[PDB]
Amino acid sequence: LPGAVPTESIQGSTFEEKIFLQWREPTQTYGVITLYEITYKAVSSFDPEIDLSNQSGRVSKLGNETHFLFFGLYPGTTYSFTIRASTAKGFGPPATNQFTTKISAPSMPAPLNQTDNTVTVMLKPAHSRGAPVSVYQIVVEEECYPVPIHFQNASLLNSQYYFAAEFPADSLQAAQPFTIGDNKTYNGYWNTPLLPYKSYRIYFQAASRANGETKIDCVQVATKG
Ligand SMILES: *[C@@H]1O[C@H](CO[C@@H]2O[C@@H](C)[C@@H](O)[C@@H](O)[C@@H]2O)[C@@H](O[C@@H]2O[C@H](CO)[C@@H](O[C@@H]3O[C@H](CO)[C@@H](O)[C@H](O)[C@@H]3O)[C@H](O)[C@H]2NC(C)=O)[C@H](O)[C@H]1NC(C)=O
């Protein structure tokens, strides 16, 4: 039977939904390696809403080239990989290492009463894809947005947009109406009344922080003339 794959030769370059797995051949080989068998298994995730009990599988990589690309993984998730080499007589001992996929931006959902100074929209919660949703943001743009800007500074900084509101994701845990321009302050952002002679498009934005990376996505929810 062939030997073990060296554990520290196993190296992975990770993406949101892929891991490129790479190793070296067994230290001693009896015969010729016909295939490698890799077991994969999710060990943990930063995503608060995920089922790990079925995030498992097995691949038989034919040939003896010492790499394989794993598609269909879940973001923000640590997968354990166990590799066995097979000679025509059978499998050698297992080697194991583990790697973590990157987090992706939360899943964005796909007007109610427009007045001279305001617009109200039905906000729908975004869903975690590798990390919780941390904050939602509402962006007002004059005719995504990683740089937050408060209305009071938007003219001096000469920005076409401002952040009208920001909420922690424990607010908006079910669908709720929200009024652009209600003059209230949300997380230090002033939901300034819209100007009745200006035209605006309004965006709903969501962010995930975990593992030191931050990922954001956004969707347009309304226009006002
Ligand atoms: C890793 O795999 C390579 C490629 O071989 C091919 O894939 C394997 C998974 C098996 O299915 C092989 O049957 C298949 O051909 C192996 O390279 C091959 O090594 C053998 C033995 O050294 C070579 O056979 C000899 O080749 C010389 C000419 O170079 C002839 O004169 C001999 O009569 C004899 O046929 C074979 O040619 C070679 N194949 C290629 C394409 O170079 C490699 O040995 C293997 N290594 C391990 C550790 O498994």
Residue numbers in the entry: 481 to 590, 596 to 628, 642 to 723
Authors' text:
Type IIB receptor protein tyrosine phosphatases are cell surface transmembrane proteins that engage in cell adhesion via their extracellular domains (ECDs) and cell signaling via their cytoplasmic phosphatase domains. Previous studies have shown that PTPRK, PTPRM, and PTPRT form homodimers, but not heterodimers, in cell aggregation assays. The homophilic (trans) interactions of R2B RPTPs determine their subcellular localization and have been proposed to function as spacer clamps between cell membranes.
Crystals grew in two space groups, P212121 and P3221, possessing two and four molecules per asymmetric unit, respectively. All six chains are essentially identical in structure (pairwise RMSDs over 220 Cα atoms range from 0.44 to 0.92 Å). The main difference between the protein structures is that one chain in the P212121 crystal has a disordered loop (residues 628–641) that in all other chains was ordered via intermolecular interactions. This loop is anchored at one end via a disulfide bond within the FN4 domain (C642 to C716), and the sequence encompasses the furin-cleavage site of PTPRM, illustrating that this site is surface accessible within a conformationally dynamic loop, but that cleavage would not significantly destabilize the fold of the FN4 domain. In both crystal forms, one chain is missing the glycan on N598, indicating that PTPRM-FN4 not only adopts conformational differences in the furin-cleavage loop but also can undergo heterogeneous glycosylation. Superposition of the FN3 domains from our structure with this previous PTPRM structure demonstrates that the FN4 domain can be accommodated without significant steric clashes with surrounding chains, and FN4 colocalizes with weak and disconnected electron density that is unmodeled in the deposited structure.
